[PDB]
Every structure is written in C-alpha cells, then in structure tokens.
C-alpha cells in the first residue's frame, strides 16, 4: 500500500503559567512512533513504537519565537493564550517513491502558511503570513524543507516500514455486523458496525434498493479502540417490514473483497 | 531513530 510519515506539532502560550508548551508527535500512517513534550521533563523524546532530542529541543525554542512574532503580526495583547500548529512529512507509494511532501502551519485554528506541492514556493493566508513568506524566501527556507522531505523523510519512512513490516504493512480487516433496534411500531434503526480494523481509512455506507442514503445516514467519526485498531458505525432509520431493502457496504484495504451486509 | 525536521521561526 501507500504510506505516510507525519509530525503533528502544537505550541500553546499560557501567560502567567510559564513558557509555551511544545508537543511534537510523529506517526507512520495511524501508528504513533514518537512523542516529545516540553512539559514532560521525563527522558526527552519517548519512543511510542517497538521499532534527535536536540532538534526537538531547538524546535521548542523556535516555536516560542514564532508565537512571539505572531502575537505581534496580529497586534494581539500579551494576556491571551494562542495556539500554533504544524504538520509536516511525506507520502510514498507502494514502491517507496515520493508521492508528495507537506509542511504547513495554522494559528489559532486557521490556516496560516503552507509549502506548495512543488516544494519551492509558499501560500500565505493573509498579510501576516506574507511577512513570514518574505522572511522565508529571503533565507531560502523552502530549499532546506525540500531537502528534508525528499531525503530524510522518505529514507526514514522506508527504513521504518521495513523494520516494522509485520505491523505497519499489515492491514487488519473490519469485523462487521448489523444490529436492529426498534424505535417505535413504525420504524427501527439498523446499525452497521466495523470493528478491529487498521488503518483507520474505511468506507461504510447504507443503500436502499441500491441507492445511496447519504442524507439519511448517521455516520460516527472513526474512533480508536486503544489496541491499534479502529471502530466505526453507520445507522439508518427504516420502516418496519422494509429491513431487507437495505444493504450496508464496507470498503477497507484489509478486505480481500468489499462486503455487502444485511440484517440477519 | 526519530528524525524530526529543523523548524524556522515564523
């Protein structure tokens, strides 16, 4: 299959409660492999999977610099707490070749700046991000980012996948069943369950007489079980007597072929 | 064995 390595970094200011917290978590697909938390104090970066502290420590300081600068760019007071988030990493195909790289930032939950897919240019969301853009253009930051994403990222993803091949390259199919719950004399809920799957990407749909029921289906967010696997369900309300007109459809990478399920 | 990226100040 295709795979991704991604770091998700959060920096959050807290005036009057010390310097901003910095946390960086690294994933291969839906598997965490590292955490660095400036508030831990426990041994610096913690492995999170069985398969450079200094860069993480310096990244803490850089993110605090960023937060200072952003407060200024938005004319904000020193009293409020603000959030800077970063995502970066690479996507590779089944042959290990680069599909694309990522390096983007959000401030207070809004997109701020992103490295374009070319790995050479920036997209800035507003006049504040244009300041960052100019600074980064002047210092040739995109060239450094491109070198990391095309080189280090892809190389280390390939090495991790090989070391961790029994887990990272194993897709676990969903276990599936349909439940039935009357709501009244006139109607009942059918709920299609998918349990125990990895990775998290899945498609679960209901059809009625072969027509998609997108508007009428309640689909819960895919959720972690805590054992590496994920869970999801999709529900529809159906007239009593008409249950056999409804089919649940499941697509997942660990399935030899897609499932069609009905009640009983 | 983690290799994070050097960040740059916004």
């Amino acid at each position: 299959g295709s795979h991704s390595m991604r770091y998700f970094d959060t920096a959050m200011s807290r005036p009057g409660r010390g310097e901003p917290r910095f946390i960086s978590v690294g994933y291969v697909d839906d598997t965490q492999f590292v955490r660095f938390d400036s508030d831990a104090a426990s041994p610096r970066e913690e492995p999170r999977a069985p398969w450079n502290t200094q860069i993480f420590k310096t990244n803490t300081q850089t993110d605090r610099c960023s937060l200072r600068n952003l407060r200024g760019y938005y004319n904000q007071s020193e009293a409020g707490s603000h959030t800077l988030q970063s995502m970066y990493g690479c996507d590779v195909g089944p042959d290990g070749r680069l599909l694309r790289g990522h390096n983007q930032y959000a401030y207070d939950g809004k997109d701020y700046i992103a490295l374009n897919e070319d790995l050479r240019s920036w997209t800035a969301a507003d006049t504040a991000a244009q300041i960052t853009q100019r600074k980064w253009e002047a210092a040739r930051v995109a060239e450094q980012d491109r070198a990391y994403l095309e080189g280090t990222c892809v190389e280390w993803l390939r090495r991790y996948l090989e070391n961790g091949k029994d887990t990272l390259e194993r897709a676990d199919p969903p276990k599936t069943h349909v439940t039935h719950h009357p709501i009244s004399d006139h109607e009942a809920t059918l709920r299609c369950w998918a349990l125990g799957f990895y990775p998290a990407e899945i498609t679960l749909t209901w059809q009625r007489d072969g027509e998609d029921q997108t508007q009428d289906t309640e689909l819960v967010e895919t959720r972690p079980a805590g054992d590496r696997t994920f869970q999801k369900w999709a529900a529809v309300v159906v007239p009593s007597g008409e249950e056999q007109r409804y089919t649940c459809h499941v697509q997942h990478e660990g399935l030899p072929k897609p499932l069609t399920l009905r009640w009983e | 064995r983690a290799f994070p990226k050097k960040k740059y100040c916004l």
Binding site: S81, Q85, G109, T179, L195, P224, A225 | -
Partner: protein, 100 residues
C-alpha cells in the same frame, strides 16, 4: 478566535460481556483550542488514574484525545464520560450505551 466544540463518544475497546475485563474509552475530537477536561465516571463518581493519549490533531487542525481505563462491566453499574471545554457553559455528560 475560532472555537470548536468537542464531539464525544463513549465505548468499550472490546465487545462488552458482563463480568469480563475490558477498557472503557472516551474519545473527544473536533475541538479547538486544546484545553479540555475529561473524567470517566462509574455510578456518578470520578474514576482515578485514567490514562490518555498524547495530544494530536486532524488535518483540519481540530484536536483529539482518547481517555481510557480498565473496567469490568456488570449489568447494574453505570458508566459515563464528563467533558468540559471553553465552548461549553456546563460539563457535558455522555453515558456509556453498549449499543453505540
């Protein structure tokens, strides 16, 4: 700035069987900013030593966390999750229903 209210799901790791050890999960997702208070409750009372995942977020920048504890369901014990966030005027309680 933007605030987004948490979505909450309460559920078990494995399919529930009375008298058999399991994990009780409270998954909070879709929220911004990141400060959030989460308690797991057994018959109204806070469970101690609940663990949680490392803060992370989705590609839409909204945060998520999993809170979890060992538990052995019985027919008569009630379980729930209690969540507070800046977007909530009071704590929100979601009961564990083994059919969701």
């Amino acid at each position: 700035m933007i605030q987004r209210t948490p979505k909450i799901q309460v559920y078990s790791r494995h399919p529930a069987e009375n008298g058999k050890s399991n994990f009780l999960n409270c998954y909070v997702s879709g929220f911004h900013p990141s400060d959030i208070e989460v308690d797991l409750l057994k018959n109204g009372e806070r469970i101690e030593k609940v663990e949680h995942s490392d803060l992370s977020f989705s590609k839409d920048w909204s945060f998520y966390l999993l809170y979890y504890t060992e538990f052995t369901p019985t027919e008569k014990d009630e379980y729930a999750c209690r969540v507070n966030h800046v977007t909530l005027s009071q704590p929100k309680i979601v009961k564990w229903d083994r059919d969701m």
